[PDB]
């Protein structure tokens, strides 16, 4: 009995009352990395924020309620199951079969 597949870690201080609301979007910068700690994808290397909307699911399980746990201004680190993440299938190549993903968004502004 584990319970919740997604484990946050705060690095750097936001607002501390500032969290994102479902129905609007969230300008954020991650950076996604295997168990091991290899990127597969990562938004500020191609030097661009990632918008999405909240309750939409545009994004996966473990961003949604990981996200909301962070305050704007906040950088903390979001760890993903493959049960959060997409399941037991995945995407082949660069997402394998029951295998944990690591995220790393930071809260930039709300829009």
């Known amino acids: 009995?584990?319970?919740?597949?997604?484990?946050?870690?705060?690095?750097?201080?936001?607002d501390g009352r500032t969290f994102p609301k479902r129905?609007?979007?969230?300008?954020?910068?991650?950076?996604?990395?295997?168990?091991?700690?290899?990127?597969?994808?990562?938004?500020r290397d191609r030097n661009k924020p990632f918008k999405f909307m909240l309750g939409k699911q545009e994004v996966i399980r473990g961003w949604e309620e990981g996200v909301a746990q962070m305050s704007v201004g906040q950088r903390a680190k979001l760890t993903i199951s493959?049960?959060?993440?997409?399941?037991?299938?995945?995407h082949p190549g660069i997402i394998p079969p029951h295998?944990?993903?690591?995220?790393?968004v930071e809260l930039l502004k709300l829009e």
Do not use: N
Request: hydrophobic residues 30%; contains cysteine; proline residues 6%.
């Open 23 to 43: 129905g609007q979007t969230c300008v954020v910068h991650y950076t996604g990395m295997l168990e091991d700690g290899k990127k597969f994808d990562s938004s």
């Open 82 to 90: 493959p049960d959060y993440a997409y399941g037991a299938t995945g």
């Open 99 to 104: 295998a944990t993903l690591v995220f790393d």
């Open 1 to 14: 009995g584990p319970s919740m597949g997604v484990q946050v870690e705060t690095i750097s201080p936001g």
